[PDB]
Amino acid sequence: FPEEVDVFTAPHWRMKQLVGLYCDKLSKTNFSNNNDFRALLQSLYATFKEFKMHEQIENEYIIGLLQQRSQTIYNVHSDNKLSEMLSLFEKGLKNVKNEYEQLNYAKQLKERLEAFTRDFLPHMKEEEEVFQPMLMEYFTYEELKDIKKKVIAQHCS
Template structure:
């Protein structure tokens, strides 16, 4: 959570609690999956696809409701901030989703190939997690204070309501 941020205008902490819960679930799941077992692998892939589609939706909501508005506010004030422009520019989510789709091909392959896929998937998820947790911290500790600096309390209350509605009330 951003330091000194009133709950009413904190746009990141609630969605990030959900994202962190999902991270913990897949870290637990990947440890307990037996990749030589097709049923185990298929169940894991299905859960991971749901999780990473939820991460993708989270990113799209942030882009549309937070980053775009922050960028245009900064632009109107002639303030340059490349971190805001680049924070979702990488393809990490797309890469993991593509790796998960590859996993379904492994369900038709040998035990050894499934186990090798498991090693690759575990490494990719660890790498993703190592970036994703600090990314969320950056949003909470750097972008939330920027929002509080350049938006009014009422604007941020409205923004938070939109962000939560998009995440949880569909």
């Protein structure tokens, strides 16, 4: 699809960049060290806050509009369980004090992140492969250009 009407590709480039970044940080983190541990969780909190913003922008500026026009999207836009990811990080930052707790938490953190990323990727793929074509049908080219402008503005501060 032409770039100027593509409402998912650039934002998803950023989200994918962020996934790569936290996967790298996760692999290098020494979970036995409290400073490494906290730094990782603070980074995750920031990243997943941006994920949360991303989904919100989509709901408000894209999906909301699309659902109003198509009338055929019955479950639509998954949730990705971001609030619960954030609550997990918060518990690590607030309740984990020593090495035993850090290493037990780490096992669960890794499992939960793997699960999230396993769902996040297909979620983004569906938007690109299913929603984008639909937008092409229910909006004019110029309408989509304007939607993209708003979407980019919200994503980029």
